Symmetry: C2
Subunit: 193 residues, 2 copies
């Protein structure tokens, strides 16, 4: 049962990422797993509950991933570079995660439970970036500048570049996004020195 | 005429898509709001995707006309750039609604080639307008020398990311904060010292 739910969520996430939440029907999820629509309904009374529980799950996976990746890193510049690297829409899992987040931005403007979940996840991320900046400022590697405003700018820049990648802007690519962000950190965050 | 019927359908459909979400709008919603039948709507737009596509085409043209009217008497590049950025704010009403729709387009683009092409052409024009404005300011000596293309990439991405924060309701975000943040970026990263 914890298992059944798990399979539904993993399958729903992928379908939502690749086909679009509103284009995914409950039979599409059943067909993808071999169950029936009634089973799916038993665990999730509505389509929205699937999205919401899938999202909850994903936010957890992503924060785990981030802890694993940053756990040994003490140098704030390296930490920030790695934080930024985790946000790239690389082929496979991360690109799929971006696809779903793009939809959640829209669904947030309409659904309060989704908006709440989105804002809590974003705030956690945002505080992380700010904390990291402040650390680098205390270590002397980062320029003394309001961390909150800088975190706001970097977060916003990450989101905008992601969109340009996902939508196919000419000359855009994950690598160019990476370079652009690394240049932002080296030239706007790092202490010229 | 019949140019009239088309127009009205598209103005209505745009507003509904913005406030309710594309996938939540039905043909009957549009018909009810205008007092026609579904058959008239279908005649002009065989499918819902055609409505979205044609509504987007129309909005892209309106928005560019709005831009020319606002900028045509402005020769100072700094003032032009400030006004250009002002037109991108999600201010109450039509501009907010347009953001609503563009957020949906970002997702729909990852799935529909015609919407993707239209979005890329419209983005490209805006991007070139930004780069051109930067280059004029450089020639006038009011903007710092820097790659206008990288700067146009950065500015455009920043705008998009800040808009998402406004629309999604990030704590402390408001159209006023976004304006201030973007004007601070221009004065400190674009304007010459
Ligand atoms: Br030019």
């Amino acid at each position: 049962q914890s298992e059944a739910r798990r399979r539904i969520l993993e399958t729903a996430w992928r379908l939502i990422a690749r086909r679009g939440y509103h284009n995914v029907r409950i039979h599409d999820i059943a067909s993808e797993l071999g169950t029936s629509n009634a089973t799916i309904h038993y665990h999730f009374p509505s389509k929205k509950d699937i999205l919401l529980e899938a999202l909850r799950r994903n936010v957890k996976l992503a924060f785990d991933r981030q802890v694993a990746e940053l756990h040994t890193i003490a140098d704030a510049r390296e930490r920030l570079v790695r934080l930024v690297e985790l946000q790239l829409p690389t082929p496979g899992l991360l690109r799929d995660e971006w696809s779903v987040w793009l939809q959640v931005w829209t669904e947030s403007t309409l659904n309060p439970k989704i908006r709440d979940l989105y804002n809590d996840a974003y705030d956690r991320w945002y505080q992380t970036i700010a904390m990291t900046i402040r650390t680098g400022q205390k270590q002397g590697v980062f320029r003394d500048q309001d961390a909150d405003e800088l975190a706001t700018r970097l977060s916003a820049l990450i989101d905008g570049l992601g969109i340009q990648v996902l939508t196919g802007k000419r000359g855009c690519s994950v690598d160019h996004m990476r370079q652009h962000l690394n240049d932002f950190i080296e030239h706007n965050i790092v202490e010229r020195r």
